[PDB]
Design a protein around this ligand. Structure first.
Ligand code: NA
Length: 156
C-alpha cells in the first residue's frame, strides 16, 4: 500500500535559493549531517532516475543507503527522492518517498510542504515508530539545506 503524509513548514530563506540548494544536497549533506560521510552516483547524471549510494556511520558502524531521484520541478520548486535500499526499509517497506515543495512565504521566506510516501508490501500498514523516524529524517535534511544557505549567503 501507499500511505501519504504531509507536514507544512516554514523558512526565512526564499524559495528559489532553497530549491537551488536542494539540488546541491550531494555536496551539502555530508558537510552538515555528521553521520553522512559521502554520496556517490551509481547511475545517472543527477536528474530524475539517478541512483545514488550514500555512506553513513551509525553507532560507529559503516552503513549504506540507496536513493533514487524521482523528479525535480523548477516550476513548483519541487525536489523529490526515494529511499530504495538500506536501514530505513524493513521487510514490509518497499520504498519511502520524500517530497519537498516550496511556495513563497510572507516576508521574503518560504512555506514548505514535506510529503512522505511510505510504500508497503501487500496489506501491510506503516510502523508508527518508522513513520516517526521517516518524518524526522525528512525534516532534518531540509533544515540541513536551509542551515547551509543561511550560514553561506553568497553562494545562493
Ligand atoms: Na558528515
Amino acid at each position: 500500500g501507499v500511505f501519504t503524509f504531509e507536514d507544512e513548514i516554514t523558512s526565512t530563506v526564499p524559495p528559489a535559493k532553497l530549491y537551488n540548494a536542494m539540488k546541491d544536497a550531494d555536496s551539502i549533506t555530508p558537510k552538515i549531517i555528521d553521520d553522512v560521510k559521502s554520496v556517490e552516483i551509481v547511475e545517472g547524471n543527477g536528474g530524475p532516475g539517478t541512483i545514488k549510494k550514500l555512506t553513513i556511520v551509525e553507532d560507529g558502524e559503516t552503513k549504506f543507503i540507496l536513493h533514487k531521484v524521482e523528479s525535480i520541478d523548477e516550476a513548483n520548486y519541487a525536489y523529490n527522492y526515494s529511499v530504495v535500499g538500506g536501514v530505513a526499509l524493513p521487510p514490509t517497506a518497499e520504498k519511502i518517498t520524500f517530497e519537498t515543495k516550496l511556495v513563497e512565504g510572507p516576508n521574503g521566506g518560504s512555506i514548505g510542504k514535506l510529503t512522505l510516501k511510505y510504500h508497503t508490501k501487500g496489506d501491510a500498514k506503516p510502523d508508527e515508530e518508522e513513520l516517526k523516524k521517516g518524518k524526522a529524517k525528512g525534516e532534518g535534511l531540509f533544515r540541513a539545506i536551509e542551515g547551509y544557505v543561511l550560514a553561506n549567503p553568497t553562494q545562493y
